[PDB]
Amino acid sequence: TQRGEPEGGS
Amino acid sequence: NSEADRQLLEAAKAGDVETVKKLCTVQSVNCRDIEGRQSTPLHFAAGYNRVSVVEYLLQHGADVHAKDKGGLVPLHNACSYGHYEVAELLVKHGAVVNVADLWKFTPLHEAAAKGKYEICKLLLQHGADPTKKNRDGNTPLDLVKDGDTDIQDLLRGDAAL
């Protein structure tokens, strides 16, 4: 599939 | 999955260190989140800048090299969101700075694409290779946004700030 984003936040 | 594992994962995300200390066992410290991208508690604490939970987990045998469903290690999560202190803690405990996920994105790719100069500098000072290409043929320098000229100079080999 497509690459996702890492778990986390600023 | 199990009840105490979900609560440990949620307590790690939330920075709720006391509940982590009460639910964390040898069997659960590296438990994966079935209903997501299979992150471990260390992935959550690292991505959400929960420094006290990160320190606790590493001390109690959390796997600094654990890969989630996409091949990310906790150092990826910290580098993507600019968490310098968490990234420095992971490297101190043996995180491999040149590890690459399933798309061959290294932590330096993450830090360069997100514009985190200090993270880029931290990784380079611990041996990160700026010439590694991901699946799309891009180096970390190729992902740097226009306007982040200090990162472009840093990845070019200029002296760091």
Author numbering:
A (entry chain C): 946 to 955
B (entry chain A): 489 to 649
Paper text:
The ADP-ribosyltransferase tankyrase (with two paralogues, TNKS and TNKS2) plays pivotal roles in diverse cellular processes that encompass signal transduction, including Wnt/β-catenin, Hippo and toll-like receptor (TLR) signalling, mitotic spindle assembly, glucose homeostasis and telomere maintenance, among many other functions. Tankyrase contains five ankyrin repeat clusters (ARCs), a sterile alpha motif (SAM) domain and a C-terminal catalytic ADP-ribosyltransferase (ART) domain with PARylation capability. Tankyrase recruits its effectors (substrates and binders) via a degenerate tankyrase-binding motif (TBM) and exerts its activities by subsequent substrate ADP-ribosylation and/or scaffolding. Tankyrase recognizes two TBMs in MDC1 to support DNA damage repair.
To confirm the underlying molecular mechanism of phospho-regulated binding, we co-crystallized TNKS2 ARC4 with an MDC1 TBM1 peptide phosphorylated at position eight of the motif (943ERDTQRGEPEGGpS*QDQ958) and solved the structure by molecular replacement (see §5). The asymmetric unit consists of two ARC-peptide complexes, which are highly similar. The TBM binds ARC4 in the previously observed binding mode, engaging a well-defined pocket consisting of a cradle that accommodates the arginine residue at position one, a central hydrophobic region that engages proline at position four, and an aromatic channel that sandwiches glycine at position six. The phosphorylated serine residue at position eight establishes a salt bridge with TNKS2 K604. This aligns with our FP binding data showing the importance of K604 for phospho-recognition. The peptide chain is slightly displaced (by approx. 1.3 Å at the Cα of serine at position eight) due to salt bridge formation, which helps accommodate the bulky phosphate group. There are otherwise no substantial phosphorylation-induced structural rearrangements within either the MDC1 TBM or TNKS2 ARC4. A nearby K602 side chain does not read out the phospho-serine modification in the presence of K604. TBM1 phosphorylation at position eight reproducibly increased ARC4 affinity approximately threefold (Kd = 1.7 ± 0.4 µM). The interaction gain conferred by MDC1 TBM1 position-eight phosphorylation was attenuated by the K604A mutation as both the non-phosphorylated and phosphorylated peptides bound the ARC4 K604A variant with similar affinities, with Kd values of 9.3 ± 6.8 and 7.5 ± 3.5 µM, respectively.
